RNA sequence: GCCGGCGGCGACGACCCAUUCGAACGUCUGCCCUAUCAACUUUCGAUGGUAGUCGCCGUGCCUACCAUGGUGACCACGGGUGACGGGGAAUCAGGGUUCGAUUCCGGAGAGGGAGCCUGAGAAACGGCUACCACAUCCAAGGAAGGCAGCAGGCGCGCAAAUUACCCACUCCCGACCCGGGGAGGUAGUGACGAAAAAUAACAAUACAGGACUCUUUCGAGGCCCUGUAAUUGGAAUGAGUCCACUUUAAAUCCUUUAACGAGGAUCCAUUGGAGGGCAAGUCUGGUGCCAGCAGCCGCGGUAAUUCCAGCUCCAAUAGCGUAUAUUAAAGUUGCUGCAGUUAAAAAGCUCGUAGUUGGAUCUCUAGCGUUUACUUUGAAAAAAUUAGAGUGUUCAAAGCAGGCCGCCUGGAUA
RNA sequence: UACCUGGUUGAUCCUGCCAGUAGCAUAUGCUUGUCUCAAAGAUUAAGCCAUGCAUGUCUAAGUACGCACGGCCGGUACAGUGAAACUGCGAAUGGCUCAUUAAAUCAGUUAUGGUUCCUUUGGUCGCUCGUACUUGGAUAACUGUGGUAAUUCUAGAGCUAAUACA
């Protein structure tokens, strides 16, 4: 069609939002920002379906305009504002921090964090380029374009920035023996160590990761993010420490609960 | 563009042959014994039979040792135990095709309230649930195809209000009190 | 069944028994329907023009008028035309106001076939000097004898004799005495003439000032055409008799008195109907029931159309939406399914009170001679017209000229109605023919009949068809 | 003899409310109406009947419970403020004018043909 | 505010880089029928080369000068399509056949073509300019057109609803918590179709009724059944009528519940059959190869098991006929899986290109090993749909909810 | 549920089709008590349309000398609500329909290292060596005179704004 699309059907919104057939026609429709539409959080849904504080539509936009709620500590007014992975909501209203970190079974869990931990932020570096005398740049997975990075950092490299400043604390080289986390494909959410990539020129990258409970998987070299050092983590985990446990013993868990 | 679902799904298949003795009179042995309305009810309770034997049978194709058949085959008997048409001791797959339409048609709300002596007929039982006379646990059903559950048996009462159960009469005993 | 048929009837009883007993008199009277009457091209029409001012008169394709139609003046022309002359009662509280209706005169379909839907509480017979009296206006008189109303006679052509002194927009008395004395005595000849011509034929007539006593006597009113003198005198003499005679006929009462007057067909609105809303308070979303040619028809209304105050039923006018309407006025209505029905018939409105039945026998006694005499049975000519008025005065000329006709139809012709006129051309090659009044071919119509051996007549004059 | 429950509660600092579930158990009588569960539930939090608000109260098959929403503020303003005007309306806080969707469409179709200070003038 | 200057918190802007939403050009593989279409394209660009022009860029996109190429029985080119393409739908052993205008994705066009202004984005039509076809007003000078948006009307036909109410929900747009939205929501019409489910149940009487016990039979009972009783009896009740709520933007429907409401419970169950196929009458009037029935075989010509009726019975049942496209039956399109001596069928005969098929045999040093097909594993692959886990919608078709006395959950999986 | 049955003969066994049987869709007939869910001018004509409505929009924050309102304080440029108009943005989304279209559309897979991109979100914005304590002219709105039978037609005259235009 002529220029851009401005609306989204319902049905045809991405399934880990887990949006109901009926409520309406039309979804959320996630507006431009950090984070791609497929795999960002409105903030509609964030309030009203998963903390469950708006009913309606109105309800949400009157939390937002009255700027009760911060994203990475700068107050957003937008109801359909892009929060994606590893991006921290702040509502210091009640003072109630999280972190968006997606659970086992694939999508964005309602996982809170103590308010100190809500002070930075961990983020893969997309490229680096260096331009205009040679002041070296960087471009990280949330877009947050950032001047004169430690020449250590290369990519596919994790960093971690305060969010009240724009720099960078530490840095976490992509190699073998690293905790990473899956973000795409069918391994979505899963956290493990790296034991090998294996290269393939003109084409992508593949890795191999092992769990925690011995399950080894492979996976695209663009759906990987370090999150710890070794195998410490330097964020807090969701409920599930990211073990991808089978139907069987999800059914014996159940059960067993009962 | 409306937010419908248009999810509708037919619940009972017509006999190939519409006019075969043998046939006739089984299924009118049937609606006799467990007083059904019509035939549609006892090809209703094929059709669900038939597509459980259908689900067995290509469950049992797989090999011992694939976690799907296990996993599947395990929440088919146990939701087939829930119902009451097996025990724990016969729980192996094999078993679900060596059941029969009577073993369904005992679970009828109606066969129950008969089969309770809360009705005195199987045809006084249709209508007895079908007047909200009927209750199970604190809920007063209506339905006669309601298909009880095992653990669900135990308790089936008299709804409270009604005029055999919870003690108010009735329009003729009102009628009758009046002009008495 | 039975009970609910019974209980409907004695509630219907009830109701028009309230709607007798309701009653409302002392002032506030209803508007006369003034009927104007003529021969061919005498000047019944253009001067309505002229009281409502109206400047396309012209516009008709023709001399001659085919349709009736309501023009629908309202107070305020009535006190702007008599602020002119000013005669008496400056702002009359007791005038309803005036309601005239246009009827088309002619020799062939004997002037509208009439039958001019009766309701003719004041009729104006327009003489015309020049050329005397006419077979059409005798035949009209004894029509207007025939069932007992009051009606006046108006001169058109007193200023075409060359001499008049063309004074416009005053007294006639006054204008009559300012010309020279031969004139007054050739106009008070020819006067004598006229009421000996009218004492003959069991009326008694003079001239609308001297006794009068209108009771006995009728009022030959003088009024000039193109200028307009004795227009004032006219509508003056008009709410006179209306306020003198019809002062408890014309009650504003609660019942139900619509009347089926014409039936159009116009483009996106299906076929309308023309009613004459006298009584009865009719509301948008409620079911009326129509008398049709093949039984009655259940019509749910959609809307009120009314056309602007002095503007008439003549051209597609902005016809403005109105939801509700009190009974005074004339107006188009339309729905679903009002194919084939009756002109000159009452309209029953119904409320919710289950389906109120059988007043058909009662109405179609010897009112017979219409449509209904089809012979769909045997062969025949295909007819189709603008208005039903029309397809009546085509079948009637039909039958007096001896040709049986098949099927009939309003609006445009279509490749249905060809086809209809194909599927007579194996019976009868000569009856295979389309006669068309004032409605528009269309081109499939045309070329589907030209590819066959089927001719249509197309013509807006009638002389022409 | 109503007994009233509440199911699922939350402090909603946000929209300066608390916002729960409420369950009505009424065996004999028929579905009571909002004025009652609210005094009720006022009287329970012990709270101005003024400042309750309740709806969507759908009564189970068998007539013995009846579940529906309730919301209480924390004052009359935040009430007036955060509630929307169809809420504000059965309590009689809020008048609707008394106006159709085609009449006010229709005036500005009108009011689109004339330019200049006369569109005011068009009524 | 701080000792005449120096400042904090925003909002509009902004060359350029990154990003998000895209968009546009491409790469590889895949489509229905037709040989009564066998060669096509290249004058006026067809295939490629060099140089430019134009374009947001790559490029015969276009111009100039050269080369003579490019595609094709592995079906080009041409013609047809009651052809928009997919996600899907119906049917169904396994294989298949048929449909897919239609709610999600992509494409296209606003009566037919063509040209363009503005803008980041249009060759826009609820923007403009011209022509072609239709057509509105008119003082005859000129003016104004676009429902394949929602209603509605005409036409066409076997074939399809209201000129309704509201931005409250789902979302979109704007300087914007505040405005607007026939997107959309809610009613009305609705036997397209799908799920649940009334039209009675129980008790007491007599059977030249049945079974079980006694007597060899006759004839004996509160052990269990029975109906074509308008016999007898109170008990239960939804359909309707109609308070009050609840529901809702406001209403409606439903659920809830006062009052009324069952003895031909006349508060009445229909649509098709009763020779065979195929479940049900060689019963009685009527007609007399006339009238008609009959999908097929056949029935009717004076005792009609079949016609028109009465009575009775059968079938499915709030539904059941009839017509027509299509699927299984059809192993009557055959790959699985059919035929060709006589039932329809092997060319009169041989050669022969393309096509298909083709005899044994051979036991790793950051680059390799002779390269594939085949087979097993891995990542990638939109939801909805389909299969299928969990969950008492009062059951079910559904829905994605819910459950416990502020809490513990789910929204799997294939 | 991997299914068959009548019909060529005096009878038989075949080949073979016609007929029956069930499902699904469009129409249509007769019938129609309760309740939930729910398709619906596609086929023929992408044929033609009266009428009404379907795209508009303001925050403390671009332009307020409309008394349209009342309010201070009366020597306070501008208290405020705010019609109108200039300016900014949107109107290229949505909705409808299936005429066209046969390696085209479209689907799965890859490429832009060969390109543009409003908006959002980051980066950048005294890095340049050469009246400023704020420069210039107009035009709407408004007032006043008009023309044409006619349209959301507009000419002439008098003032005045900028985040318009310089
Ligand atoms: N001076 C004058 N003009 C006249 C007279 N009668 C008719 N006219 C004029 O003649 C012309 C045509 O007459 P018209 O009024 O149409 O006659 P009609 O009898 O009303 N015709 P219709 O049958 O249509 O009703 C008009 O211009 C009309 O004014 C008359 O007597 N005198």
Redesign the interface.
């Known amino acids: 069609a002529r220029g851009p699309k401005k609306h989204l059907?319902?049905v045809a919104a991405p399934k880990h939002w887990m949006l109901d057939?009926?409520?309406?026609?039309f979804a959320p429709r996630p507006s431009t920002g950090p984070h791609k539409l497929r795999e960002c959080l409105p903030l509609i849904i964030f309030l009203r379906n998963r903390l469950?504080?708006?009913?309606?539509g109105?309800?949400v936009k009157?939390?937002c305009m009255?700027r009760?709620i911060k994203i990475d500590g700068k107050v957003r007014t937008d109801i359909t504002y892009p929060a994606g992975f590893m991006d921290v909501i702040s509502?210091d209203?009640?003072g109630e921090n999280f972190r968006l970190i997606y659970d086992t079974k694939g999508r964005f869990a309602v996982h809170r964090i103590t308010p100190e931990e809500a002070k930075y932020k961990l983020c893969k570096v997309r490229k680096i380029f260096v331009g205009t005398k040679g002041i070296p740049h960087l471009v990280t997975h949330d877009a947050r374009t950032i001047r004169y990075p430690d020449p250590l950092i290369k990519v596919n490299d994790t960093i971690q920035i305060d969010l009240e400043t724009g720099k960078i604390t530490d840095f976490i080289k992509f190699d073998t023996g690293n905790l990473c986390m899956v973000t795409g494909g069918a391994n979505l959410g899963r956290i493990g160590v790296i034991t090998n990539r294996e290269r393939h020129p003109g084409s992508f990258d593949v890795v191999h990761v092992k769990d925690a409970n011995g399950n080894s998987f492979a996976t695209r070299l663009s759906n990987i993010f370090v999150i710890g050092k070794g195998n410490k983590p330097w964020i807090s985990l969701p409920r599930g420490k990211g073990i991808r446990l089978?139907?069987?013993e999800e059914?014996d868990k159940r059960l067993a609960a009962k | 563009?409306?937010?419908?679902?248009w999810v509708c799904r037919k619940t009972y298949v017509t006999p190939r042959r519409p006019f075969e003795k043998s046939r006739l009179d089984q299924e009118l042995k049937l609606i006799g014994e467990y007083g059904l309305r019509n035939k549609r009810e006892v090809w209703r309770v094929k059709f669900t039979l038939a597509k459980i034997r259908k689900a067995a049978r290509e469950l049992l194709t797989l090999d011992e040792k694939d976690?799907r058949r296990?996993?599947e085959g395990?929440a088919l008997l146990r939701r087939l135990v829930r119902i009451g048409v097996l025990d724990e001791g016969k729980m192996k797959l094999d078993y679900i095709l060596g059941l029969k339409i009577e073993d369904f048609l005992e679970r009828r709300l109606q066969t129950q309230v008969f089969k309770l002596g809360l009705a005195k007929s199987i045809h006084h039982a249709r209508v007895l649930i079908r007047q909200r006379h009927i209750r199970v646990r604190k809920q007063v059903v209506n339905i006669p195809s309601f298909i009880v559950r095992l653990d669900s048996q135990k308790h089936i009462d008299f709804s409270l209000r009604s005029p055999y159960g919870g003690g108010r009469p009735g329009r003729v005993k009102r009628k009758n009190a009046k002009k008495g | 069944e039975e009970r609910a048929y019974d209980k409907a009837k004695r509630r219907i009883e009830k109701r028009r028994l309230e709607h007798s007993k309701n009653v409302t008199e002392k002032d506030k009277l209803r508007a006369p329907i003034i009927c104007v009457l003529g021969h061919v091209d005498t000047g019944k029409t253009k001067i309505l023009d002229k009281l409502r001012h109206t400047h396309v008169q012209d516009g008709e394709a023709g001399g001659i008028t085919q349709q009736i139609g309501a023009t629908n003046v309202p107070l305020e022309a009535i006190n702007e035309q008599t602020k002119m002359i000013k005669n008496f009662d400056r702002e009359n509280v007791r005038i309803p106001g005036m309601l005239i209706i246009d009827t088309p005169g002619h020799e062939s379909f004997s002037n509208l076939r009439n039958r001019g839907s009766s309701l003719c509480d004041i009729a104006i017979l327009v003489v015309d000097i020049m050329h005397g009296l006419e077979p059409q206006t005798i035949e009209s008189i004894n029509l207007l004898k025939s069932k007992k109303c009051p009606f006046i006679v108006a001169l058109n052509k007193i200023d075409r004799l060359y001499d008049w002194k063309k004074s416009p927009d005053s007294d006639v008395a006054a204008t009559l005495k300012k010309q020279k004395k031969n004139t007054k005595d050739e106009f008070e000849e020819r006067a004598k003439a006229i009421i000996v011509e009218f004492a003959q034929q069991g009326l008694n007539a003079a001239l609308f000032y001297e006794n009068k006593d209108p009771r006995t006597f009728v009022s030959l009113v003088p009024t000039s055409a193109h200028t307009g003198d004795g227009m004032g005198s006219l509508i003056y003499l008009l709410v006179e008799l209306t306020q003198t005679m019809l002062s408890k006929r014309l009650a504003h009462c609660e019942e139900l008195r619509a009347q089926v007057m014409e039936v159009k067909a116009l483009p996106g609105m299906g076929t309308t109907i023309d009613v004459i809303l006298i009584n009865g308070r009719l509301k948008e979303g409620d079911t009326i029931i129509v008398p049709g040619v093949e039984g009655p028809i259940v019509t749910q209304i959609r809307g009120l159309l009314t056309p602007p105050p002095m503007k008439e039923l003549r051209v597609k006018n902005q016809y403005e939406k109105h939801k509700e309407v009190e009974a005074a006025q004339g107006v188009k209505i339309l729905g679903k399914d009002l194919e084939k029905t009756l002109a000159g018939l009452p309209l029953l409105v119904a409320y919710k009170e289950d389906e109120i039945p059988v007043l058909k026998d009662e109405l179609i006694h010897e009112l017979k001679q219409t449509l209904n005499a089809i012979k769909l049975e045997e062969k025949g000519v295909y007819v189709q017209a603008s208005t039903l008025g029309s397809l009546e005065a085509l079948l009637e000329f039909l039958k007096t000229s001896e040709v049986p006709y098949a099927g009939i139809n309003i609006g445009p012709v279509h490749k249905k109605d060809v086809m209809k006129a194909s599927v007579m051309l194996e019976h009868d090659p000569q009856y295979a023919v389309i006669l068309a009044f004032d409605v528009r071919i269309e081109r499939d119509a045309q070329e589907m009949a030209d590819s066959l051996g089927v001719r249509i007549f197309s013509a807006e004059i009638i002389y022409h068809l | 003899t109503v007994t009233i429950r509440t199911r699922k509660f939350?402090t909603?600092?946000?929209?300066q409310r608390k916002?729960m579930v409420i369950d009505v158990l009424h065996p004999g009588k028929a579905t009571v109406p909002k004025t009652e569960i609210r005094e009720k539930l006022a009287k329970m939090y012990k709270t101005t009947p003024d400042v309750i608000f309740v709806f969507g109260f759908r009564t189970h098959f068998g007539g013995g419970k009846t579940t529906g929403?309730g919301m209480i503020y924390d004052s009359l303003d935040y009430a007036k403020k955060?509630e929307?005007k169809h809420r504000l309306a059965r309590h009689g806080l809020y008048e609707k004018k008394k106006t159709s969707r085609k009449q006010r469409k229709e005036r500005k179709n009108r009011m689109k043909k004339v330019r200049g200070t006369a569109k005011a003038n068009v009524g």
């Open positions: 059907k319902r057939k009926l409520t309406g026609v469950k504080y708006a009913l309606t109105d309800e009157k939390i009255q009760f509502i209203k009640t089978t139907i069987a059914r | 563009p409306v937010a419908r679902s976690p296990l996993f395990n | 939350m909603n600092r946000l929209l916002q929403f955060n929307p």
